[PDB]
Write a protein that binds this ligand. Structure first.
Ligand code: ZN
Length: 88
C-alpha cells in the first residue's frame, strides 16, 4: 500500500498511518518528491517507531529512487519500503 507525503504533511499524522498499515499488512511504502517532503517522510517513519514499539514491533526501511508524476510531468522521487519486524 502506498502513502504519499508532501512538504506540508504532518509527521505525526503520517506516522499514525504508517503504524496502522504496519500493524495490519506488515509493510507499507512511503513516497516523497523534493527535500521538504522527503524530510517530513523521514520524521514520520522515525515517529512511527514510537507508535508500534508498544505492539512489540519495530521497522526497517530501504530507500530507492522511483519515477512518479507531479502535475503530469514525470519526476524522480524517493520511496521508502518499510517492513515490520517483531521484537519478541
Ligand atoms: Zn529487525
Amino acid at each position: 500500500e502506498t502513502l504519499r507525503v508532501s512538504s506540508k504533511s504532518r509527521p505525526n499524522s503520517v506516522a499514525g498511518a504508517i503504524a496502522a498499515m504496519l500493524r495490519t499488512k506488515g509493510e507499507v511504502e512511503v513516497q516523497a518528491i523534493g527535500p521538504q517532503a522527503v524530510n517530513q517522510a523521514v520524521k514520520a517513519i522515525a515517529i512511527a517507531r514510537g507508535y508500534i514499539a508498544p505492539d512489540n514491533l519495530d521497522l526497517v526501511v530501504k530507500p530507492a529512487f522511483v519515477k512518479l508524476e507531479l502535475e503530469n510531468e514525470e519526476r524522480t522521487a524517493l520511496k521508502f519500503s518499510i517492513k515490520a519486524h517483531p521484537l519478541e
